[PDB]
Amino acid sequence: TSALTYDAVQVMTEAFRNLRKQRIEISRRGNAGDCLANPAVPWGQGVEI
Amino acid sequence: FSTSEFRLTPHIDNLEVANSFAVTNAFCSQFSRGVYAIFGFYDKKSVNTITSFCGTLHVSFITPSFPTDGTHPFVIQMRPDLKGALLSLIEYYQWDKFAYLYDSDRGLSTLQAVLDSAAEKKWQVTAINVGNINNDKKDETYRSLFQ
Amino acid sequence: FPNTISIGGLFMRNTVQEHSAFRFAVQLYNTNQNTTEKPFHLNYHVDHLDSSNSFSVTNAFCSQFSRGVYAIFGFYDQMSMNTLTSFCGALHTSFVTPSFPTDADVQFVIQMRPALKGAILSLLSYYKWEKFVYLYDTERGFSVLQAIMEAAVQNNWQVTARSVGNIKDVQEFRRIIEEMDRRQEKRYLIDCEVERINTILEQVVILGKHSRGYHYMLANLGFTDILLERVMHGGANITGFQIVNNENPMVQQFIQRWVRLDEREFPEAKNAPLKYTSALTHDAILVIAEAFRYLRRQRVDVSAGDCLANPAVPWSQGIDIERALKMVQVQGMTGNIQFDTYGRRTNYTIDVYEMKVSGSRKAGYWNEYERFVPFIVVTTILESPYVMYKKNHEQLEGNERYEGYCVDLAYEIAKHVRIKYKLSIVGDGKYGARDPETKIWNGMVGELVYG
Ligand SMILES: *[C@@H]1O[C@H](CO)[C@@H](O[C@@H]2O[C@H](CO)[C@@H](O[C@@H]3O[C@H](CO)[C@@H](O)[C@H](O)[C@@H]3O)[C@H](O)[C@H]2NC(C)=O)[C@H](O)[C@H]1NC(C)=O
Ligand SMILES: *[C@@H]1O[C@H](CO)[C@@H](O[C@@H]2O[C@H](CO)[C@@H](O[C@@H]3O[C@H](CO)[C@@H](O)[C@H](O)[C@@H]3O)[C@H](O)[C@H]2NC(C)=O)[C@H](O)[C@H]1NC(C)=O
Ligand SMILES: *[C@@H]1O[C@H](CO)[C@@H](O[C@@H]2O[C@H](CO)[C@@H](O[C@@H]3O[C@H](CO)[C@@H](O)[C@H](O)[C@@H]3O)[C@H](O)[C@H]2NC(C)=O)[C@H](O)[C@H]1NC(C)=O
C-alpha cells in the first residue's frame, strides 16, 4: 500500500504536469459550496481531469 | 516528485475509515476547501459512499485499496486484480479440493470468483470466514478450526 | 409532552404498496376514537428516493434531521446499507426498517424482517441434503451465504454455488441448468429476488424436462408473489416461506379493511396481493405506536440543527427511545414481535408451505428455540418364451395383450401379494449396461434407477 501510494503521487504529479503542459487553466478558489447542494450542479472541468 | 511548474497542497485528514459518518465529514471538509482531487483509502463497507459522492460531484478519487465490483466513474485505483492471478496459479498447480480461509473486511468478490470458477472447473472449496473471531478468544477457535 | 409526533419516510423505487400501507396504518392509528390507545396525533413526512446512491440518501436523511423527527421508517439496499446504519448510529436517530437483515451487529437499527438462515439450516438438516445447488444474488445480505458455507464445512456437504446477481442473459441460466443436469443434480436452493426467481422458474418451464423428480427450495419471503403455477403442472414440489398467516384474524381484518380502498389515494391495493413488506410496515407502525405509548406511560422526555456538525453532539434521549424500540412485545400480523439488544427479531414463527403434486399444505412452522416443528409399473422385454404377444393382440387392451412365462409369474406374484400392476415394455431394447464415459445405466436398470 505504501508503494502504491508512492506510485499514485507520481501519477497525480504527471497528470497535473500534463495539464500544465496542455495550457488548460482550471484555477479557482475555496468557494466550491456545500457538499449537500440540492441540486448539486457539477463543474465540467473535472470531467477532463 | 516536486516539480517546477506548480506545487501541490495536500489537506491531510486523519479520521476513521469504517464509520461512514466521519468519512462524509472529512469529504465535506475537503470539499469546502475547494479541492480538485482526493487521495484516500476506503473500507469494504464504505465503498458505496465514496463511489456515490465521487461520481455525483464528479470529483476524482485515487486509491490504493481493493478493486471494486463494477464500473464507477472518477475512481482511479492502484491495486490490480488478484482473482485472475490466483485462478491462474491454481490452474497451474492443477487442484481439485482445497481450503480457503478468507477475511470479510475487503468485500467478498474473491470468494465469489473462486466459487464460480471452482464450480465451473469442478473443484471442492472448503471456504471458511475467519474475520468474525474476536481477539480475546482467538486460540481455541483456531484449534477447533484446524481440527 | 408532544402531542406532536412527526416521523420520516424513506421510500425507494418499487415502494408503492408499501407507501400505501404506511399511509393506511397512519390513518388507522389516527382514527381510533379512544383516549387510551390513541393518546396523541401521529404525523409524518415522506421523501421519495429517486436513486440508490448514497448522495440522495444522505440528502433525504439530512432533510429529515433538519425537519426534526423522532423515528425514521425506511428501506435500504446494498448501496445504502452502511450509509443509513452509520448516519443513524452516529446521530443517535432510531431507524426502523423491513428490509434485509444486516450482516454486522450495529446499533439504532430496528429490523422488522426476521432472519431466515436458522429455518433454512433446520430444513436442510431435516431433509438430510448433502449434495445440492445454491443460486444466490448479493442484494439481500451475505449472512445466508456464510451460513450455508459454514454448514457445508461442519456437516460435510457438497454445495455447488452460483452468484447470479450480475447475470442478465437467460442463456447463462439455461447452461447452468444444463451443467447441473450433467452433474445429475436434483436439489436446489435459490436465495434471490422475486423477479429473478420468476425468471429462473420461467427458464425451467421453457427449457422443460426439469419438473418431475426435482425439488426447488425457494428461500424467500415473497412466496405469494412467486409465479410458480406452470411449475406445479409438471410434477415438481417447492418448499417456500411465509411469515403472514391468513388464519390470523388481525390479518384478515386488515384484508377486509384493505380491499375497500380507492386507487387514487392508495394505489396498488386492489389489483395486487398483499406483499409481506406491507405487513411488516403495518407491524412496524404498531411497534412505533406501542413504543411511544410506553414513553408516555413512563413520563420519559423525547424533546434541530445540522446533520454535519463538527462535533455532532447528538441528543441523548433517543437512546432511551432505542430502548423503547428494543422492549416492544406485541402481537402483529407476523405473530409475536420482540427485539434483542441489536434490534433483530426473536420469539417469532416462520410458516413453511410445501406444494407437492397432491397439492399445497402447511408442512410446519419454525421456532428458533426448539426446532422446526412439522405437522404398479412392471417392465420387461419381448423374449420367448418369457414375454410374447398374442395372436389377436390388437383386438384387446391392457395387460391381456401379452403372454408367456414371466406374464404368468407376474400374475402369481400379484396373486400372492394382492396389488394391481401394469405391464410396460422397455423402449431401447437393451437389457442393462453402464457406459464407462457417461456412467449412465441403460435399459430396465436405468428405468429402475432413474425412477
Ligand atoms: C380503549 O382501548 C383499550 C383497548 O383494550 C381499552 O383500554 C383498556 O382498559 C382496561 C381497563 O382496566 C385495561 O385493563 C384490562 O382490563 C380488562 C378487564 O378488567 C382485563 O381483562 C385485561 O386483562 C386488562 O387488565 C387495558 O389494559 C386497556 N387496554 C389498553 C390497550 O390500554 C378500552 O376499553 C378502550 N376504550 C376506552 C373507552 O377507553
Ligand atoms: C419433494 O421434496 C422432498 C424433500 O423435501 C423429496 O424427498 C423425499 O422423497 C422420497 C421418495 O418418494 C419420499 O420419502 C421417502 O418415503 C419412504 C417411505 O415411502 C421412506 O422409506 C424414505 O426414507 C423417504 O423418507 C418423499 O417424497 C420425500 N421425503 C419426505 C420426508 O418428504 C421428494 O423427492 C420431492 N418430490 C419430488 C417429486 O421431487
Ligand atoms: C418467546 O418464544 C416462546 C416460544 O418458545 C413463546 O412463549 C409463549 O408465550 C405465550 C405468551 O405468553 C405463552 O402463552 C400463554 O402461556 C401462559 C402460561 O405462562 C398461559 O396461562 C396462557 O393462557 C397462554 O397460553 C406460551 O405458553 C409460551 N410458550 C409456548 C411454548 O408457546 C413466545 O413467542 C415468547 N415468550 C414471551 C413470554 O414473549
Swiss-Prot record, chain A:
- Protein name (Swiss-Prot/TrEMBL): Glutamate receptor 2
Q: Which tissues show it? A: Detected in forebrain. Detected in dendrites of neuronal cells. Expressed in the pyramidal cell layers of CA1 and CA3 and in the granule cell layer of the dentate gyrus.
Reproduce the free-text note on domains from the UniProt record: The M4 transmembrane segment mediates tetramerization and is required for cell surface expression.
Job description of the protein: Ionotropic glutamate receptor that functions as a ligand-gated cation channel, gated by L-glutamate and glutamatergic agonists such as alpha-amino-3-hydroxy-5-methyl-4-isoxazolepropionic acid (AMPA), quisqualic acid, and kainic acid. L-glutamate acts as an excitatory neurotransmitter at many synapses in the central nervous system and plays an important role in fast excitatory synaptic transmission.
Localisation per UniProt entry: Cell membrane; Postsynaptic cell membrane; Postsynaptic density membrane
Q: How is it modified after translation?
A: Palmitoylated. Depalmitoylated upon L-glutamate stimulation.
Further facts: The postsynaptic actions of L-glutamate are mediated by a variety of receptors that are named according to their selective agonists. This receptor binds AMPA (quisqualate) > L-glutamate > kainate.
Which span of the entire protein is present here? 296 to 344 of 883
Taxonomic superkingdom = Eukaryota
**Induction (record text):** Down-regulated in the pyramidal cell layer of CA1 in the hippocampus by global ischemia.
State how it assembles: Homotetramer or heterotetramer of pore-forming glutamate receptor subunits. Tetramers may be formed by the dimerization of dimers. May interact with MPP4. Forms a ternary complex with GRIP1 and CSPG4. Interacts with ATAD1 in an ATP-dependent manner. ATAD1-catalyzed ATP hydrolysis disrupts binding to ATAD1 and to GRIP1 and leads to AMPAR complex disassembly. Interacts with GRIP2. Interacts with GRIP1. Interacts with NSF via its C-terminus. Interacts with CACNG2, PICK1 and GRIP2. Interacts with GRIA1 and SYNDIG1. Part of a complex containing GRIA2, NSF and NAPA and/or NAPB.
Name the family the entry cites: Belongs to the glutamate-gated ion channel (TC 1.A.10.1) family. GRIA2 subfamily.
Curated annotation (Swiss-Prot), chain C:
Q: Which UniProt keywords apply?
A: Cell membrane, Disulfide bond, Glycoprotein, Ion channel, Ion transport, Ligand-gated ion channel, Lipoprotein, Membrane, Palmitate, Phosphoprotein, Postsynaptic cell membrane, Receptor, Signal, Synapse, Transmembrane, Transmembrane helix, Transport
GO molecular function terms noted in the UniProt entry: AMPA glutamate receptor activity; amyloid-beta binding; glutamate-gated calcium ion channel activity; glutamate-gated receptor activity; ligand-gated monoatomic ion channel activity involved in regulation of presynaptic membrane potential; transmitter-gated monoatomic ion channel activity involved in regulation of postsynaptic membrane potential
A GO CC term assigned to this protein in UniProt: terminal bouton
The chain's Extracellular topological domains, given as residue ranges, are 1-451
- Enumerate the catalysed reactions: Ca(2+)(in) = Ca(2+)(out)
The protein's predominant localisation is membrane
Q: Does the keyword Glycoprotein apply?
A: yes
Q: What else is known?
A: The postsynaptic actions of Glu are mediated by a variety of receptors that are named according to their selective agonists. This receptor binds AMPA (quisqualate) > glutamate > kainate.
Task: Report the function annotation for this chain.
Answer: Ionotropic glutamate receptor that functions as a ligand-gated cation channel, gated by L-glutamate and glutamatergic agonists such as alpha-amino-3-hydroxy-5-methyl-4-isoxazolepropionic acid (AMPA), quisqualic acid, and kainic acid. L-glutamate acts as an excitatory neurotransmitter at many synapses in the central nervous system and plays an important role in fast excitatory synaptic transmission by inducing long-term potentiation.
State what protein this is by name.
Answer: Glutamate receptor 3
- First and last residue shown, out of the full length, are 24 to 494 of 888
